[PDB]
């Protein structure tokens, strides 16, 4: 009966039924997005209304619709026709991805280009990629994908080893027309295979790894109730899943004595962008918004036990809609387990004679998704001591190109003739804060050095300063690692026993933000990625840092539009949006399949508790 | 028969015997430091000479000696009298620490101060702390400790809860005289206890934690031979232990095909400093050099199974000298185990139909030490993919003071009346590099942004630049997180299959460096801590960034003196010294015993291998 429960197969089929009955889901209609809406603010003793938001595409070229349905009540709440040239195209449909290669296979310009390179069309795979917004006026209001070619020598060959550089095509996936084929000239197609399961390349597999067995003989220490409500070591939360954002955490709270104390109302990765830094016209348009354009939840992997998730694992199998409104289960799509995390606290005291050691643990909630060549793991961790952490794990096969004769300032060499364009992977975590409730504020805290002199005659003193971010115009912040800059979210009306506002401190990794020129298309479409931290006043329609419709959508929506409202954020219902990312200059070690690399952030309690919250953890 | 084997009990008793026979270890002599010297460069087919370095203190006040002994040959190689006012005092002796409280207990000034505060002398513990170098001319050439008082209410009470502020004393631990007692006025002694094993404070212990069992049914995948030579998953190394540095790694190499490829010749934490940022004269002198002054290896804990180290653990029990030259074992002082480290690499490929997942693992070598109220864990990790990482874990009980009425810019409040002075914990990792051998160089690599314009018309291009550090004068570097700055150690004479020099990239955490005024005593004594990275030309006598004798030693030695030589480091035998640390503004959650906090660094292969080195890792 929780309003935060996962969508059921039945709810999705019911949305389908309601849309059908309403005349909104005839044979030419396709569901491009469907997700449950969160309950509105307040929603106390008010009866539940489970509502779903739906983006409906039309394959005949009619205008799409945004629709809200009450599945509880069997009604359409609202339905509005979208002008996609203005507000953006709907997310890419899985069915549209296949279209590109099929259409290109009988296009005379494409065939001419392949023949110039002596490539069999039957062996040429096309990566169908999001198009963005550049100088092509005819694309405005049209659903376009751009295709890059890769040769697959046999069915089990890794095509990524064989990029076909100097060639790109653009395709209208509704009218099913090839709008453009650009051939800037032949490059050698790299010849070495990248088949990481071929014994020829791996050599004999190691026989040196002895097993590691992780078990829980009495089961896990967390409980799951209502399908997705987790209780573990004082923590309480609900594990949601949305087709766009993937795993979303709701109602993160900590039971301190008798009181369930809220910390974060909603945590998600609300966008992720992968901008490429190769100025070649073959790839200079390439920017994946995996969340906004592709929908990362849609491509979540089914995770195998003893392989993707090790230990005593509890799975959730979230349900999503297919293109026709039928429910589809992602079996074992979400892993939940606890794991040991080394020493929590330790002191061997001479004077008392007491030696004390306690172990730490963390609760892990994760999923993994595959977007073409890339595979991303999203991990949320809750620790015994009140720390909350996110970590992204980036792996997959690197996106390749030719390596130019005489080198490149924007591409690295992986193998003979094989290049990897430089790129970033940049995430936006949207943290709808609720530190002891909704009345919150943000301070930027920097270390403050002090000069030797009166009051500091030994020149040893150092301090810090906190600056309250009072209004949204003042709340777009950059990192400063050199000064130890962090941001504290506190509740000015909730004081700890020492009469200080309770708080949590966000610790960033201080990785580089978006590197593109500030006047580029990508700097405008991914404006959030240009700054490390933004704070907005909560609003129900401000969900993504890039707005609702990212595909082929220019700037005009998202975070820059939200903060222009210049709203009060000093002791109000606020949302923190943290940008963090990896800057990747691919190395030879990343080829032919890349070892995981990571990036993330954490929040640690900062005068939230009246003393350590783990004094009651038992020995051994 | 390895020259890198741990010191045996027999070797230490033999050093004692040789010193005795030579007339260097009579009844007034004490061993303040004893350690094996590493073999000299070359030392190929030359027969081994196990040599030990010894600092010998004299309790009658005669000059100390530095002595080198050949235990293989039964000889004294050299013995020189030290002028400690010039070159520094010897490390603090464990026996000298007790002296402070005992002497103060019958000192009239101390007793007057305690009586003014109504404190029973029998209940007053004195933290005996290193003295440093300040304005007290009479301390020059003398062994001084400074004592700060803490009340212990009963034998099992945590005295740290009850600091006696406004009082400090200075003691000559050789002549056994109290040189000074400073009383700046009474402060309330905080009254709440900090007894983290008292049921009154912990409340009922949790019954919610179910067991986690980590086992290896066939044993571990690493082998130990010659006492301390480790082979694990292509890695090869020797695990040393020194009383000053603690765990030291030697001959870190990776077996790539048929060739054992060196990476790091010697890795250690060569210093650690804990400077305090409270300008009160009671503490403005407080700076622990735990490595240099106290000797962290000496205080290494005995680590209990299932408690300090979980899983299938292999222990080393290193042997050190006591003050008289007798061997003393630290039982179970070093933990060695492998552990699972999540996903190593993963890709689910549409086109090939191949879904591939592999697990990562790391080899862990650790120890834990206790220095008064603080407890530090030192962890080295080796990963399957060639990554090397260090992590320090800081825990213990925070060093306390009174919390001033009306607050403080330099102290935080933990409990009623109880303060915690701001401080840092700053480490120096000395990495004697050997990337494919000893001919190495360092480049600083920054990300390079590019302007939209000709050659970059979409404004998407980004790049990077590398600057070779050619001479020591150019090799004192600061972090720049905003530009993604890293440092690459490469071998200009060893190229991978793509004709690029093999390398390893150091990734720092970019935490703040030493905050003290640059004209302070601590900025001079801990000059290394003011910059993130230094590169020197290898020399056998350049072991510590603070020199051989840190106790009560001014600037004049260490890294600033080493680089003045302005030696060639462009394709030479070089040493990287990385400064990294935590800046601590204690929070209420740190009280009464602090949850672990961490800091570290890692090095990842950068064109070292000809492709991923983990293609031969087996499934599941
Ligand atoms: Cu092939
Ligand atoms: Cu990448
Ligand atoms: Cu007490
Ligand atoms: Cu600290
Ligand atoms: Na909020
Ligand atoms: Na070296």
Curated annotation (Swiss-Prot), chains A, B:
The record's comment on cofactor binding reads: Binds 1 copper ion per subunit. Contains 1 topaquinone per subunit.
Q: Which GO terms describe its molecular function?
A: copper ion binding; primary methylamine oxidase activity; quinone binding
Q: Do the record's keywords include Oxidoreductase? A: yes
**Residue numbers binding Cu cation:** 423, 425, 584
Chain residues that bind substrate: 288-299, 371-376
Q: Name one Pfam family in it.
A: AGAO-like_N2
S-S pairs: 309-335
The UniProt similarity line reads: Belongs to the copper/topaquinone oxidase family.
The UniProt subunit note reads as follows: Homodimer.
Record protein name field = Phenylethylamine oxidase
């Amino acid at each position: 009966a929780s309003p935060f429960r996962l969508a059921s197969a039945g709810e999705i089929s019911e949305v389908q039924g309601i849309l059908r009955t309403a005349g909104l889901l005839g044979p030419e209609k396709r569901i491009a997005y469907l997700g449950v809406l969160d309950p509105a603010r307040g929603a106390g003793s008010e009866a539940e209304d489970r509502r779903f938001r739906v983006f409906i595409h039309d394959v005949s070229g009619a205008r799409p619709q945004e629709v809200t349905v009450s599945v509880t009540n069997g009604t359409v709440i609202s339905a509005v026709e979208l002008d996609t040239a203005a507000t953006g195209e709907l997310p890419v449909l899985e069915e549209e991805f296949e279209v590109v290669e099929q259409l290109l296979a009988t296009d005379e310009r494409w065939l001419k280009a392949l023949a110039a390179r002596n490539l069999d069309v039957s062996k040429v795979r096309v990566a169908p990629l999001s198009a963005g917004v550049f100088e092509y006026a005819e694309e405005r209001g049209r659903r376009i994908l751009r295709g890059l070619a890769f040769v697959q020598d046999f069915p089990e060959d890794s095509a990524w080893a064989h990029p076909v550089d100097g060639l790109v095509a653009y395709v209208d996936v509704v009218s099913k027309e090839v709008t453009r084929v650009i051939d800037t000239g032949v490059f050698p197609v790299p010849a070495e295979h990248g088949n990481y399961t071929d014994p020829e390349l791996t050599g004999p597999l190691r026989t040196t790894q002895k097993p590691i067995s992780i078990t829980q003989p009495e089961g896990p220490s967390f409980t799951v109730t209502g399908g997705n409500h987790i209780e573990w070591e004082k923590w309480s939360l609900d594990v949601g899943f949305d087709v766009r954002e993937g795993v979303v955490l709701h109602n993160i709270a900590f039971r301190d004595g008798d009181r369930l104390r809220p910390i974060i109302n909603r945590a998600s990765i609300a966008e992720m962008v992968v901008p490429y830094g190769d100025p070649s016209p073959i790839r200079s348009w390439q920017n994946y918004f995996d969340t906004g354009e592709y929908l990362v939840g849609q491509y979540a992997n089914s995770l195998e036990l003893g392989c993707d998730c090790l230990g005593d694992i509890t799975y959730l199998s979230p349900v999503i809609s297919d293109a026709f409104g039928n429910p589809r289960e992602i079996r074992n799509g979400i892993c939940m387990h606890e794991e040991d995390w080394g020493i929590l606290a330790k002191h061997s005291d001479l004077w008392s004679g007491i030696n004390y050691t306690r172990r730490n643990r963390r609760m892990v909630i994760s999923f993994f998704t595959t977007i073409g060549n890339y595979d991303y793991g999203f991990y949320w961790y809750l620790y015994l001591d009140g720390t909350i952490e996110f970590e992204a794990k980036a792996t997959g096969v690197v996106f390749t190109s030719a390596f130019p004769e005489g080198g490149s300032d924007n591409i690295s060499q992986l193998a003979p003739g094989l290049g990897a364009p430089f790129h970033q992977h940049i995430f936006s975590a949207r943290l709808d804060m609720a530190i002891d409730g909704f009345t919150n504020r943000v301070e930027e805290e920097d270390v403050v050095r002090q000069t030797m002199g009166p009051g500091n005659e030994r020149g040893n003193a150092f301090s810090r300063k906190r600056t309250v971010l009072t209004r949204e115009s003042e709340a777009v912040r950059e990192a400063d690692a050199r000064t130890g800059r962090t941001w504290i979210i506190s509740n000015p009306e909730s004081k700890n026993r020492l009469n200080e506002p309770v708080g949590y401190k966000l610790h960033a990794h201080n990785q580089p933000t978006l590197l593109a020129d500030p006047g580029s298309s990508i700097a405008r479409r991914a404006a959030f990625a240009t700054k490390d931290l933004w704070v907005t006043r909560y609003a129900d329609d401000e969900r993504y840092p890039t707005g609702d419709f990212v595909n082929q959508h220019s700037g005009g929506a998202g975070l820059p539009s939200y903060i222009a409202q210049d709203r009060d954020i000093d002791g109000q219902d606020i949302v923190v949006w943290h940008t963090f990312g990896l800057t990747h200059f691919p190395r030879v070690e990343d080829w032919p399949i890349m070892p995981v690399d990571t990036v993330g952030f954490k929040l640690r309690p900062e005068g939230f508790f009246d003393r350590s919250p783990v004094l009651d953890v038992p020995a051994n």
